[PDB]
Write a protein that binds this ligand. Structure first.
Ligand SMILES: O=C1CCCc2nc3c(cc21)C(=O)CCC3
Length: 282
C-alpha cells in the first residue's frame, strides 16, 4: 500500500502495536559473540543491545578492537551510517578513535546527557574553548572551536587532533536537544528541519566517512533518524515514490543492527516524518 493512506488505515483501526510486533517477529537474528565476551562487559551500556559480529565497527588496535557500534550500509539509497550507544566513562576515548579511523565528518546526538534524573551518556566533548580534552588511552585531543545554540538544536565546531601524527580535522557536532523525556514529539517539523541541517553540512555525503549517530542505546531515536533519511532519499531516486515501503526499509536496516525503532510510537512517528517530509521536498 501507499504510505499516507496505510497510515490513516492503521490509525482508524488502532493496530500500531500489531504492526510493530510483526516487524519484531520478522527481524534478523545474527550472532554477537564478540560483544558478549567477559572482557567487554564495561564496554556495553545495556546487556540486551549488542552489535552483530558481521557488521560491527572494529577499532584499529590489537589489544581490544571492540566498540558497541554498527555499520548500516544501504545499497539502493547509497548511504552509510554508523549507529552507536552513548559513550560511557570508559569508552570516550574509543568513541573518538572510531570517529578518526572511519573519517567521519559529523556526529549526530539525539539525547541530553541527563534525562529522567539519570545519566544517559558521558560528557564527551568540551564545553569551553579554553578547556580542551585529552584522551590519553587513544592519544587524541579535542577542542571546542565555536557553538551555535538554537531553539531545538545546537551545532558545534570541534577540532580533533591525532597527537601521534599531529594531523588535525574539523568535526561537526549536531545536537538535537528537545526530544521529550517520555514519548515522541507531537509534530515532526523540528526533527525534519534538523535532518536537513545535517544534510546541508556535507556530513551525510560520499566524500566523507559515515556519519556517527547515537542516543542512549543507539537503536531508538537513532533508528528513527536513519530510517527517515533513507526513505526520503529513495522517494527522490525512484520513478514511483509511492513504491517506497517503510516497513521493508526498516527490516533491511535491522539486518545490520538489532532493535532499530524501540516502540510502536516511534514507528508511527517515523511514518509521520516521512509523510510530511515528502511534501516539503517538492
Ligand atoms: O526542513 C525541511 C522540511 C521539508 C523538507 C525539506 N526539503 C528541503 C530543505 C528543507 C526541508 C532544504 O533546505 C534543502 C533541500 C530541500
Amino acid at each position: 500500500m501507499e504510505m499516507e493512506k496505510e497510515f490513516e488505515q492503521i490509525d482508524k483501526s488502532g493496530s500500531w502495536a500489531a504492526i510493530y510486533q510483526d516487524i519484531r517477529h520478522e527481524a534478523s537474528d545474527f550472532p554477537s559473540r564478540v560483544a558478549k565476551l567477559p572482557k567487554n562487559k564495561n564496554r556495553n551500556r545495556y546487556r540486551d543491545v549488542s552489535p552483530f559480529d558481521h557488521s560491527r565497527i572494529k577499532l584499529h588496535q590489537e589489544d581490544n578492537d571492540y566498540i558497541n557500534a554498527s555499520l548500516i550500509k544501504m545499497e539502493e539509497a547509497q548511504r552509510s551510517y554508523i549507529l552507536t550507544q552513548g559513550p560511557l566513562p570508559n569508552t570516550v576515548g574509543h568513541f573518538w578513535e572510531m570517529v578518526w579511523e572511519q573519517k567521519s565528518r559529523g556526529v549526530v546526538m539525539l539525547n541530553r546527557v541527563m534525562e529522567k534524573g539519570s545519566l544517559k551518556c558521558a560528557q564527551y566533548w568540551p564545553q569551553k574553548e579554553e578547556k580542551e580534552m585529552i584522551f590519553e588511552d587513544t592519544n587524541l585531543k579535542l577542542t571546542l572551536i565555536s557553538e551555535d545554540i538554537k531553539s531545538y538544536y545546537t551545532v558545534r565546531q570541534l577540532e580533533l587532533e591525532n597527537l601521534t601524527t599531529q594531523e588535525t580535522r574539523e568535526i561537526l557536532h549536531f545536537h538535537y536537544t528537545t526530544w521529550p523525556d517520555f514519548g515522541v514529539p507531537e509534530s515532526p517539523a523540528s526533527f525534519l528541519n534538523f535532518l536537513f541541517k545535517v544534510r546541508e553540512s556535507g556530513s551525510l555525503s560520499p566524500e566523507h566517512g559515515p556519519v556517527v549517530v547515537h542516543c542512549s542505546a543507539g537503536i531508538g531515536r537513532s533508528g528513527t533518524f536513519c530510517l527517515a533519511d533513507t526513505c526520503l532519499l529513495l522517494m527522490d531516486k525512484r520513478k514511483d515514490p509511492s513504491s517506497v515501503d517503510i516497513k521493508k526499509v526498516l527490516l533491511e536496516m535491522r539486518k545490520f543492527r538489532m532493535g532499530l525503532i524501540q516502540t510502536a510510537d516511534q514507528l508511527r512517528f517515523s511514518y509521520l516524518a516521512v509523510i510530511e517530509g515528502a511534501k516539503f521536498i517538492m
